[PDB]
Ligand binder design. Structure first.
Ligand SMILES: Cn1ncnc1[C@H]1c2n[nH]c(=O)c3cc(F)cc(c23)N[C@@H]1c1ccc(F)cc1
Length: 338
């Protein structure tokens, strides 16, 4: 029997849920026979990324695109008439599929490679996880952040916080050290599919590989965060059939922000800048900022930023070095769909 709190045990089950892994693969139309969880290979996936990059290029300028489509389906067997990879959104969906596959492989490997099994798998995450007491001020601050920064245009659901966890990944403090005293450190959201979280906890937030198409990345390949909970929660890809999601709060060392109103695929920041801020029309009210253990929490309700000429409804924040993030909390959220 495990010594871990029930909420933590429930999180471990959730994150190592093999059935969720398989359901995801069925929804992607992957052939589970020909490409089982244990068989996923880093080198095949890398080659698949490159083919998707060639596809995107061929689309941007009918026979050759059929052949590339087929080369992709040979590398990543599907179980379908096979849809042509002939537009940016289709390509993007396959890239996101490959990302999700990669983290699923990580989860499956950890799982397969005397004590209660929940405890054995907990240890494999190499992450200290503690429950934040529902009645603490810490929890209250976090619930406020969730409540106040739900955007008015994300009306498909409300959020309810079920559990709040405090997390410390092995090695992250040391890795974050050079950034620990950069100025402008902010507690920001990052949402991702549940089936990615074993990978995220064991390896941290990562940046897309060189081989991946840049298409879809408004500010280039980086790690993206929001100051509005719902903007991030949308990337949980929850649904009525699976309405429980996981979302992170990260301390992000933003330093001097390169403020942008429109897409720009950053390959190198201007010297002296440490992050990108995509400027939204709505921003959390600066007067309501609260410090939490030295870090600003922009938990104000949304007001007008005064920026009209922008591509974005809400802010986003991007860093280009994985060491500029120190993960602090993990929330289990129930999405109540309307
Ligand atoms: C899909 N994805 N994969 C890695 N990162 C993400 C997204 C993202 N994930 N999670 C967040 O919380 C987030 C919060 C934002 F303000 C903005 C975000 C994100 N945009 C990122 C984005 C969107 C489309 C795209 F093609 C590439 C990147």
């Amino acid at each position: 029997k495990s010594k871990l709190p029930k909420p933590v045990q429930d999180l471990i089950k959730m994150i190592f849920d093999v059935e969720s892994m398989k359901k995801a693969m069925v929804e992607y139309e992957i052939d589970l026979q020909k490409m089982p969880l244990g068989k996923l290979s880093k080198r095949q996936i890398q080659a698949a990324y490159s083919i998707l990059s060639e596809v995107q290029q061929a689309v941007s300028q009918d026979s050759q695109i059929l052949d590339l489509s087929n080369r992709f389906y040979t590398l990543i067997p599907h179980d379908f008439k096979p849809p042509l990879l002939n537009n940016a959104d289709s390509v993007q969906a396959k890239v996101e599929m490959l990302d999700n596959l990669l983290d699923i492989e990580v989860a499956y490997s950890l799982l397969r490679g005397s004590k209660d099994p929940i405890d054995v798998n907990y240890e494999k995450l190499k992450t200290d996880i503690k429950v934040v007491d529902r009645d603490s001020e810490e929890a209250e601050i976090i619930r406020k952040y969730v409540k106040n920064t739900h955007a008015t245009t994300h009306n498909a659901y409300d959020l309810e916080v079920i559990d709040i966890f405090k997390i410390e990944r092995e090695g992250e403090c040391q890795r974050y050290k050079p950034f620990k005293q950069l100025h402008n450190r902010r507690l920001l959201w990052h949402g991702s599919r549940t089936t990615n979280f074993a990978g995220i906890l064991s390896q941290g937030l990562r940046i897309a590989p060189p081989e991946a198409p840049v298409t879809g990345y408004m500010f280039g390949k980086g790690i993206y965060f929001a100051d509005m909970v719902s903007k991030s929660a949308n990337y949980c890809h929850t649904s009525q059939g699976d309405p429980i999601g996981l979302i992170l709060l990260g301390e992000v060392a933003l330093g001097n922000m390169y403020e942008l109103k429109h897409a720009s695929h950053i390959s190198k920041l201007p010297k002296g800048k440490h992050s990108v801020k995509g400027l939204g029309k709505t921003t959390p009210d600066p007067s309501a900022n609260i410090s939490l253990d030295g870090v600003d929490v922009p938990l104000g309700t949304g007001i007008s930023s005064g920026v009209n000429d922008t591509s974005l409804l809400y802010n986003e924040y991007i860093v280009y070095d994985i060491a500029q993030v120190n993960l602090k909390y993990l929330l289990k959220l129930k999405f109540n769909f309307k």
